[PDB]
Structure 1
Amino acid sequence: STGSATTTPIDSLDDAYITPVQIGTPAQTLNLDFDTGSSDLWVFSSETTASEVDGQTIYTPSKSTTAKLLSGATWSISYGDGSSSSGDVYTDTVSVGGLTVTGQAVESAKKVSSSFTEDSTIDGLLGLAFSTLNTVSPTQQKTFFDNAKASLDSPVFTADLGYHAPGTYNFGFIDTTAYTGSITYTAVSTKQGFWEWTSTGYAVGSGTFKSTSIDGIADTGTTLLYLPATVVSAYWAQVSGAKSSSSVGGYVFPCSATLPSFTFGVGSARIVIPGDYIDFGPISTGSSSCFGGIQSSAGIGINIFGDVALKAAFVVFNGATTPTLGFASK
C-alpha cells in the first residue's frame, strides 16, 4: 500500500504545516502537525477541557463505531518549546492520504498547554519519530508509520515541505518526479529515538564550505534551524545589523536586509537554503526588527534541522531495519 497527502502551511511564515487525517468510523477529519521529532499521535477531543479548546476540530470517540478505550492507558508529553498535553487513549482506524491503519493508538487530550489552545489551526500532532519515544503508559504504543510499515510497498515516508506553498507527505514510495538530481543517503542513529544524523558541514552565502561534523535531528515539528553557536555566529556576521538579543530570545536582523543563503552538507552533497527561507518576519507587528530562522542550539542540547532546513529538500525517512535519511535538492 501507499498514501499521499498534501501538507499546508498554517500561516504566512510557514510556522508549521497541517495535513488532513481521517480518524474513526465514519471518518472525523482533523488537521494534524506531522512531527518527525516526536512519537505520539494526539488530538483535541470531546474530552479536552472546554476552556482549552478555541476553534480546533475535535475527535469524539463516542461517535466512532471503531473506537475502543485502551484501558488504563494515559499519556503526557512535553515538547522542546515548553508546551505540553496529556490525556487517555483510544484505538481507532486512522487514514492518511488513502493509507489506512487499524488499531492505531489515538491519544485523546484532556489537557493541553496554552500554546496549543492559542493555535486554532492545529488539531493535534502525528508523531513520526521512533516508537521508543512514545509516552503512553503503562504500555508504550507504536507510531502510525510503525503500524503501517509492514503493509507499505517500501518502508519509507517522505517529507516535501513547501516554501510559502503546500507540499506533500508520501508513505510507502519515492516520487522520483518530486526532486532534482539524486538522493544522498546518510546514516541514522536511533539511540535517542530521533532521526539523528551527522551533517558534513556548512557554507554561508557564496563562502567556502567548512567541513565539520554536525550531529542533529531531522524534525518536521520544529520551525527553525538550530545549530552550534559558532556556526550561527558565522552566518549572522554576514548580515549587517544582525545581533543576538537576549530580550527577544535569539538573533534578529533589520527587516530591510537581504539574507545570504545557508548550505549544509549531506555526505558529499549540498542542500542550499535560500536566504529568504531564513526570514521569519517582524518580531512584533509593525517592527522593523525581524526574527532569524537560524538560531543557536547551545541551550537545547541537540542541533535541530527543522522546517527551515527540511523545506529546502526532498527528504526520505527510510525505516528499513537499519534506518537512514535521504536528502535531495528540488
Structure 2
Amino acid sequence: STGSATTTPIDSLDDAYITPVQIGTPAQTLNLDFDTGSSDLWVFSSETTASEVDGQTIYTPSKSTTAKLLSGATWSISYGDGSSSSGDVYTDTVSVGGLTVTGQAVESAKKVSSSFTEDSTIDGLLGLAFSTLNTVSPTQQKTFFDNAKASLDSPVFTADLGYHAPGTYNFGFIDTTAYTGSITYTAVSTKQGFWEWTSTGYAVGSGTFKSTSIDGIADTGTTLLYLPATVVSAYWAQVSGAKSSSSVGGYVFPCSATLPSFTFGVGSARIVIPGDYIDFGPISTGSSSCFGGIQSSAGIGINIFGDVALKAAFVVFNGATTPTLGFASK
C-alpha cells in the first residue's frame, strides 16, 4: 500500500504545517501537525477541557463505531518549546492520504497548554519519530508509521515541505519526479528515539565550505534551524546590524536586510537554504526588527534540523531494519 497527503503552512511564515487525517467511522477529519521529533498521535477531543478549546476541530470517540477505549492507558507529553498535553487513549481507524491503519492508538487530550489552545489551526499532532519515545502508560504504543510499515510497498515516508506553499507527505514510495539530481543517504542513530544524523559541514552565502561534523535531528515539528553557537555566529556576522537579543530570545536582524543563503552538508552532497527562507518577519507587528530562522542550540542540548532546513530538500525517512535518512535538492 501507499498514501499521499498534501501538507499546508498554517500561516504566512510557515510556522508549522497541517495535514488532513481521517479518524474513526464515519471519518472525522482533523488537521494534524506531522512531527518527526515526537511519537504520540494526539488530538483535541470531546474530552478536552472546554476552556482550553478555541476553534479546533475535535475528535468525538462516542460518534465512531470503531473507537474502543484502551482501558487504563494514559499519556502525558512535554515538548521542547515548553508546551504540553495529556489525557487518555482510544484505538480507532486512522487514514492518511488513502493509507489506512486499524487499531491505531489515538491519544485523546483532556488538557492542553496555552500555546495549543491559542493555535486554532492545529487539531493535534501525529508523531513520526521512533516508537520508543511514545508516552502511553502502562503499555507503550506504536506510531502510525510503525503500524503501517509492514503493509507499505517500501518501508519509507518522505517529507516535501513547501516554502510559503503546500507540499506533500508520502508513505510507502519515493516520488522520483519530486526532486532533482540524486538522493544522498546518511546514517541514523536511533539511540535517543529521533531521526538523528551527522551533517558534514556548512557554508554561509558564497563562502567556502567548512568541513565539520554536526550531529542533529531531522524534526518536521520544529520551525527553525538550531545549530551550534559558533556556526550561528558565523552566519549572522554576514548580516549588517544582526545581533543576539536576550530580550527577544535569539538573533534578530534589520527587516531591510537581504539575507545570505546557508548550505549544509549531507555526505559529499550539499543542500542550499535560500536566504529568504531564514526571514521570520517582524518580532512584533510593525517592527523593523526581524526574527532570524537560524538560532543557537546552545540552550537545547541537541541540534535541530527543523522546517527551515528540511523545506529546502526532499527528505526520505527510511524505516528499513537499519534506518537511514536521504536528502535531495528540489
Range class of TM-score, shorter chain: over 0.9
Tell me by how many angstroms 1:17 deviates.
0.1
SS in structure 2 of the partner of residue 235 of structure 1: helix
Identity of aligned residues (%): 100
SS in structure 2 of the partner of residue 22 of structure 1: strand
Q: State the Cα RMSD in Å.
A: 0.1
Tell me by how many angstroms 1:120 deviates.
0.1
Tell me by how many angstroms 1:226 deviates.
0.1
- Mapped to 1, the partners of 2:266 and 2:102 lie a distance apart of 36
Question: What is the match of residue 198 of structure 2?
Answer: 198
Residues 22-67 of structure 1: CA deviation (Å, up to 9, x unaligned)? 0000000000000000000000000000000000000000000000
- Mapped to 2, the partners of 1:145 and 1:84 lie a distance apart of 23
Tell me by how many angstroms 1:324 deviates.
0.1
Tell me by how many angstroms 1:239 deviates.
0.1
Tell me by how many angstroms 1:254 deviates.
0.1
- Mapped to 2, the partners of 1:73 and 1:231 lie a distance apart of 43
- Mapped to 1, the partners of 2:312 and 2:70 lie a distance apart of 40
Tell me by how many angstroms 1:325 deviates.
0.1
Tell me by how many angstroms 1:270 deviates.
0.1
Question: What is the match of residue 264 of structure 2?
Answer: 264
- Mapped to 1, the partners of 2:240 and 2:294 lie a distance apart of 15
Structure 1's consecutive aligned runs of 4 or more residues displaced over 4 angstroms after TM superposition are none
Segments of 5+ residues of structure 1 without an aligned counterpart are none
Residues 228-284 of structure 1: CA deviation (Å, up to 9, x unaligned)? 000000000000000000000000000000000000000000000000000000000
- Mapped to 1, the partners of 2:315 and 2:294 lie a distance apart of 19
Question: What is the match of residue 12 of structure 2?
Answer: 12
Question: What is the match of residue 52 of structure 1?
Answer: 52
Residues 40-99 of structure 1: CA deviation (Å, up to 9, x unaligned)? 000000000000000000000000000000000000000000000000000000000000
SS in structure 1 of the partner of residue 150 of structure 2: helix
- Mapped to 2, the partners of 1:269 and 1:287 lie a distance apart of 38
- Mapped to 1, the partners of 2:71 and 2:271 lie a distance apart of 46
Question: What is the match of residue 231 of structure 1?
Answer: 231
SS in structure 1 of the partner of residue 149 of structure 2: helix
Matched, 1:211 2:211: yes
Residues 116-139 of structure 1: CA deviation (Å, up to 9, x unaligned)? 000000000000000000000000
- Mapped to 2, the partners of 1:139 and 1:212 lie a distance apart of 41
SS in structure 1 of the partner of residue 146 of structure 2: helix
- Mapped to 2, the partners of 1:239 and 1:70 lie a distance apart of 53
Residues 133-184 of structure 1: CA deviation (Å, up to 9, x unaligned)? 0000000000000000000000000000000000000000000000000000
- List aligned pairs for 1:260-299, cutoff 5 A: 260-299=260-299
Tell me by how many angstroms 1:227 deviates.
0.0
SS in structure 2 of the partner of residue 244 of structure 1: strand
- Mapped to 2, the partners of 1:214 and 1:72 lie a distance apart of 42
Tell me by how many angstroms 1:318 deviates.
0.1
- Mapped to 1, the partners of 2:329 and 2:53 lie a distance apart of 39
- Mapped to 2, the partners of 1:207 and 1:93 lie a distance apart of 51
SS in structure 2 of the partner of residue 147 of structure 1: helix
- Mapped to 2, the partners of 1:173 and 1:193 lie a distance apart of 23
Tell me by how many angstroms 1:316 deviates.
0.1
- List aligned pairs for 1:151-170, cutoff 5 A: 151-170=151-170
- Mapped to 1, the partners of 2:132 and 2:191 lie a distance apart of 9
- Mapped to 2, the partners of 1:69 and 1:37 lie a distance apart of 26
- Mapped to 2, the partners of 1:58 and 1:327 lie a distance apart of 35
Segments of 5+ residues of structure 2 without an aligned counterpart are none
SS in structure 2 of the partner of residue 148 of structure 1: helix
- Mapped to 2, the partners of 1:116 and 1:89 lie a distance apart of 19
Question: What is the match of residue 310 of structure 1?
Answer: 310
Question: What is the match of residue 88 of structure 1?
Answer: 88
Tell me by how many angstroms 1:314 deviates.
0.1
Tell me by how many angstroms 1:10 deviates.
0.1
- Mapped to 1, the partners of 2:138 and 2:291 lie a distance apart of 41
- For these two proteins, the number of residue pairs brought into alignment is 330
SS in structure 2 of the partner of residue 317 of structure 1: strand
- Mapped to 2, the partners of 1:138 and 1:80 lie a distance apart of 23
Question: What is the match of residue 127 of structure 2?
Answer: 127
